[PDB]
Amino acid sequence: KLQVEQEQSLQNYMSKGDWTNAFLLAMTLDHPMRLFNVLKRALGESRSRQDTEEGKIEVIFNEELDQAISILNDEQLILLMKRCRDWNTNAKTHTIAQRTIRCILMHHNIAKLSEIPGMVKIVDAIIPYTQRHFTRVDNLVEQSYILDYAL
Amino acid sequence: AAAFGVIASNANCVWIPASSGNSNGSGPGQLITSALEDVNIWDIKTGDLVSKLSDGLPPGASDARGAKPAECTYLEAHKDTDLLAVGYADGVIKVWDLMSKTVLLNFNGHKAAITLLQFDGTGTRLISGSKDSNIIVWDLVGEVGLYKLRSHKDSITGFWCQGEDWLISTSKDGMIKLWDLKTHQCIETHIAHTGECWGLAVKDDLLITTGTDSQVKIWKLDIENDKMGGKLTEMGIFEKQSKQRGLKIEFITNSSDKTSFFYIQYSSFILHPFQTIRSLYKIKSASWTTVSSSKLELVLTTSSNTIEYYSIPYEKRDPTSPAPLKTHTIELQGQRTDVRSIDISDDNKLLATASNGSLKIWNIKTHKCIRTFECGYALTCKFLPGGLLVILGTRNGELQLFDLASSSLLDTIEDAHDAAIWSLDLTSDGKRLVTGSADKTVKFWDFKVENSLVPGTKNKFLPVLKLHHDTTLELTDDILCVRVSPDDRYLAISLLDNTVKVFFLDSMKFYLSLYGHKLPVLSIDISFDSKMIITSSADKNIKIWGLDFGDCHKSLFAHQDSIMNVKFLPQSHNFFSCSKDAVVKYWDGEKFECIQKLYAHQSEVWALAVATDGGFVVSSSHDHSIRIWEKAGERLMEALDLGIAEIEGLEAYNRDMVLIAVNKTPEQYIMDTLLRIRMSQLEDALMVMPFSYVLKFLKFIDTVMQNKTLLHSHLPLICKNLFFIIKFNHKELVSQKNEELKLQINRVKTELRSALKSTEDDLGFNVQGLKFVKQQWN
Numbered sequence: 001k002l003q004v005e006q007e008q009s010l011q012n013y014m015s016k017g018d019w020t021n022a023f024l025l026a027m028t029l030d031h032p033m034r035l036f037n038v039l040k041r042a043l044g045e046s047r048s049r050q051d052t053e054e055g056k057i058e059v060i061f062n063e064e065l066d067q068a069i070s071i072l073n074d075e076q077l078i079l080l081m082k083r084c085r086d087w088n089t090n091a092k093t094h095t096i097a098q099r100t101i102r103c104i105l106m107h108h109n110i111a112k113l114s115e116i117p118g119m120v121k122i123v124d125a126i127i128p129y130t131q132r133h134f135t136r137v138d139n140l141v142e143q144s145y146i147l148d149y150a151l
Numbered sequence: 152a153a154a155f156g157v158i159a160s161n162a163n164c165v166w167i168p169a170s171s172g173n174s175n176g177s178g179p180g181q182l183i184t185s186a187l188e189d190v191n192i193w194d195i196k197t198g199d200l201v202s203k204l205s206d207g208l209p210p211g212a213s214d215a216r217g218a219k220p221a222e223c224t225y226l227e228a229h230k231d232t233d234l235l236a237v238g239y240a241d242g243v244i245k246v247w248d249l250m251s252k253t254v255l256l257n258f259n260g261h262k263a264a265i266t267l268l269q270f271d272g273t274g275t276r277l278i279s280g281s282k283d284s285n286i287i288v289w290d291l292v293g294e295v296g297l298y299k300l301r302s303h304k305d306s307i308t309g310f311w312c313q314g315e316d317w318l319i320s321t322s323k324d325g326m327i328k329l330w331d332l333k334t335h336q337c338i339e340t341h342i343a344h345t346g347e348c349w350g351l352a353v354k355d356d357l358l359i360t361t362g363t364d365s366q367v368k369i370w371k372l373d374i375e376n377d378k379m380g381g382k383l384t385e386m387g388i389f390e391k392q393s394k395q396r397g398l399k400i401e402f403i404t405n406s407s408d409k410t411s412f413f414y415i416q417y418s419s420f421i422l423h424p425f426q427t428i429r430s431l432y433k434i435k436s437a438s439w440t441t442v443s444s445s446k447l448e449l450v451l452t453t454s455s456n457t458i459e460y461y462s463i464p465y466e467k468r469d470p471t472s473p474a475p476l477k478t479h480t481i482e483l484q485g486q487r488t489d490v491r492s493i494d495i496s497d498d499n500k501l502l503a504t505a506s507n508g509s510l511k512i513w514n515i516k517t518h519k520c521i522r523t524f525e526c527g528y529a530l531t532c533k534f535l536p537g538g539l540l541v542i543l544g545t546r547n548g549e550l551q552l553f554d555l556a557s558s559s560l561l562d563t564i565e566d567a568h569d570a571a572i573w574s575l576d577l578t579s580d581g582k583r584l585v586t587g588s589a590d591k592t593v594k595f596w597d598f599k600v601e602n603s604l605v606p607g608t609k610n611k612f613l614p615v616l617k618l619h620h621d622t623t624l625e626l627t628d629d630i631l632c633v634r635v636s637p638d639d640r641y642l643a644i645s646l647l648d649n650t651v652k653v654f655f656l657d658s659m660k661f662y663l664s665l666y667g668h669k670l671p672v673l674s675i676d677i678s679f680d681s682k683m684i685i686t687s688s689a690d691k692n693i694k695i696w697g698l699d700f701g702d703c704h705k706s707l708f709a710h711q712d713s714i715m716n717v718k719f720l721p722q723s724h725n726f727f728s729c730s731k732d733a734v735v736k737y738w739d740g741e742k743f744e745c746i747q748k749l750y751a752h753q754s755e756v757w758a759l760a761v762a763t764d765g766g767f768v769v770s771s772s773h774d775h776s777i778r779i780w781e782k783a784g785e786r787l788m789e790a791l792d793l794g795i796a797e798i799e800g801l802e803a804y805n806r807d808m809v810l811i812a813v814n815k816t817p818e819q820y821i822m823d824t825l826l827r828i829r830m831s832q833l834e835d836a837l838m839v840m841p842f843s844y845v846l847k848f849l850k851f852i853d854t855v856m857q858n859k860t861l862l863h864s865h866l867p868l869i870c871k872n873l874f875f876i877i878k879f880n881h882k883e884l885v886s887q888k889n890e891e892l893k894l895q896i897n898r899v900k901t902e903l904r905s906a907l908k909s910t911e912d913d914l915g916f917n918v919q920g921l922k923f924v925k926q927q928w929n
Contacts (some may be wrong), residue, residue: 002342004343005340005413005810006342006377006700007338009338009339011338011339012336013339014337028619041862043326044861044862045859045860045861045862046859046860046861046906046909047859048906048909056442056525076163077268079584081490091380091867092865092867093911098910098914098917099912099913100918101917101921102913102916102917102920105920110923110924110927114922120925120928121448121923123924123928124925125923126921127921130914130917130921131918133914134914134915134918136867137907137910137914138911140866140867140907141904141907141908141911143874144870144900144903144904144907145904146552147873147874147877147900148584148896148897148900150882151882
């Protein structure tokens, strides 16, 4: 009821600081667009330094969120995962939608722990999009060697 | 033809009633300024007319005022009483001089009426939240660029704490929000209602809120994760507003339960006796309570169209309240309510406006004497020619006789009706009375002095006219208005069967009807040339008629709501139309044209008469007052010359001992303008640009690939551009030397192939990571 509204004031306030409780709080609530914003500012900058599982490290720790993915439940797994289905559609954003996916298979077993809902439409749906994004970045990579390779 | 009147703001009007007080302002302390339909300066302990700021002629301007009509929302004074400031019913705030009545500035930016307007403790900031769901800060310069807080959906109520920081807000949206002053963000919103925050007051550290819930909720100032201290319940109905004591040892509360009560050990209860009172609180639910600046009394803004004086039971103050006093109004609000009917005399010096319980005497703007016998609002008024007597008709079926000398009724005209008197008028000398009566008959009345046996001062009813049983489908028998031929040949009278019937001076013969009206009529009149007659009806249609029937001259259909009164000029040249939509309409009688439209009546006009003088206009309204009248590649080259022009400036910083593109660095400019141009034919913009564009170009690439900015451009854009600029021109067709650009490109492309190979490996594990669970879900 009312604590949902003041809880949304907590979600508006939490974006100034850390992103973990903002991530879980906006994850269990509405709306997923601001959830896309905090994942954008978190996973947005290109960085490839020391150990993570989805790339959540900065000057302030965001690999705590790596444990918060570990603590997440199945209905939030399917609720986030259909947002990955929605975010795999358009170009130039799908990379963000890649990052959590490589996370979750590291933090749950192969069974997608025991009691599992229906997501065969999902795990069917994500394969052609990523298969399609395979070849484009392959062409940028193999054409990127050509500017070096001449001289 | 020349009609009288002007488009100026004032024509010696008496339109300001000094009534309907909602708020009030404490100015010099001894004087208290009253928010009304003007700014009326009062004394706080006498209640007399010190000064009234209204429309007129300030020195140095024309069509300027002291205050306006269309009721003032808040009045307040400057902290050194050196500024005047009124928020009105419009979206514009006016600041007037305190001493003179000139104007300083007009503040606009509100689309609705101002519901919150006050100064600060510094005074240099003005604050005004309005009914358009935002609060706007202001400056004496006119600085709108400071703040604009909009997070609400209704009108706004509460505000400042004098720390010059850390504001709070209470609004009528069902929300009470918290804010920081520097960079506004809703850190916390408190919600302890479901309706409307009526009145707001902080005591010293306790903020209380009043609402429809009829409860007083208390609150702490230095608050976070809302602090609650308890709820006072059940005032009896919803509280309207309240006030803290200026000495801050009590707290007075007000409601629409007509009871004011103060807390005292102030405390969380009421712990002082209240049977000391002798001058009981109020007749009407009041709007705002102020402790008086003399520290003994009370000022109460009632909804009974006046504000008043009282006290609060305590030993420092008067332990009872005194009788309420009012200012010297012009005796237009000293008498009680709305005017239904006005009348003029022959000497043009008797203006009389009747009411629920009063009849007043005016010459032009000076009042002589009141006369009160009205047991109702007077539907009609009629003088005696000569100004000796006046005949009145109330909502009782009762006609009253008043003399002009004093308030004493000479004769109560004999109660001979079962329905009220709507209309009445007299002949040329004044010896025949025809009246409005739903007794299905038309009543003539005698008139003379009483020195005989037939009273003409009590109008003995000898003659009888009745033939009213004509059959229609609307209603058989009711009259609306009556009208006497000034040449005395006939009588015209209105009916409810959409007709008018004309019968001559003696008994019934049928001159003429008029019928065809979709709605019944309110006003019919005869001119002095006596060939035509006007008619006005509630179908928004005024018709002129001669003698014809079924041949419409012109259906003058020009209004939006039903009419009130349409009359000729008293010398047969002009006719005017006042209606329910508060606008006066001047119309030339010889043509169907209009000469002047008068919109200065923000109040609904009910009745209106114009004298035989031909120099003024008298109006009755709902404020009961009278208004008297008379390149793309150049964006790239300019961009690169700018960004390299700054990078070389920052390069020789101190080892060697432009405000805007836009960012903390110009290079965030440079890539984003690449995203600004469109996806098609930007290659034409690239192939324009020479080798100097290339030399100044690659440095931004190494800048953003050392800066690891993927947040404002993307590797498909960078490869999509660089792969074109390498194929146009060139590396060994612009120079041939083993230079810093040549080894610069080597680290650039290594950065790109590594950073893109990372995403390649992540996707290349992601897909086959997804397949193998579908291998098992067989």
